[PDB]
Amino acid sequence: GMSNKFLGTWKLVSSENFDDYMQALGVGLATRKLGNLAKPTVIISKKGDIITIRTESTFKNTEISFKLGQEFEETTADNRKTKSIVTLQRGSLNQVQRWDGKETTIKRKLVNGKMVAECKMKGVVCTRIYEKV
Numbered sequence: 794g795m796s797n798k799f800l801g802t803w804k805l806v807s808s809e810n811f812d813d814y815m816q817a818l819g820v821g822l823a824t825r826k827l828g829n830l831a832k833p834t835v836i837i838s839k840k841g842d843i844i845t846i847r848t849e850s851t852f853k854n855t856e857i858s859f860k861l862g863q864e865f866e867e868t869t870a871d872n873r874k875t876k877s878i879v880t881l882q883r884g885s886l887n888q889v890q891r892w893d894g895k896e897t898t899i900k901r902k903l904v905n906g907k908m909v910a911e912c913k914m915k916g917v918v919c920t921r922i923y924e925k926v
């Protein structure tokens with residue numbers, strides 16, 4: 794199952810190409826300016842076989858709870874209503890979001906004790922690095 798090393802609280806320390814990624818999602822300018830300044834905390838928790846990823850920041854809070862391999866309805870930070878799914882691949886915690894015929898991926902993997910989120914949309918790639926805190 795998900796590695797227990799994911800469990801805990803994570804703080805963003807680096808974000809690369811997040812603006813171009815938000816644009817690819819269709820997020821407008823005012824929202825992107827605040828999104829580019831956000832340094833969110835991400836809390837990953839587990840109750841039985843339901844995993845919860847909770848994102849907290851001054852600008853926006855989000856939370857998804859899910860079971861691996863089971864589609865679920867998601868409301869994203871930019872208020873997209875998506876059909877999403879989280880699965881594992883070589884220990885990486887990979888999320889797909891589908892809506893209005895579009896599709897974006899958020900792959901969260903542990904690299905030397907840090908959590909690295911790789912976000913992809915229409916060939917645009919964003920990388921966000923978190924420290925465990």
Ligand SMILES: CCCCCCCCCCCCCCCC(=O)O
Nearest residue numbers: 815820828831833853870871910921
């Ligand atoms: C982080 C504040 C949200 C700002 C709202 C603008 C649109 C962003 C929507 C998608 C956010 C992607 C973040 C997931 C990757 C991560 O956990 O670092």
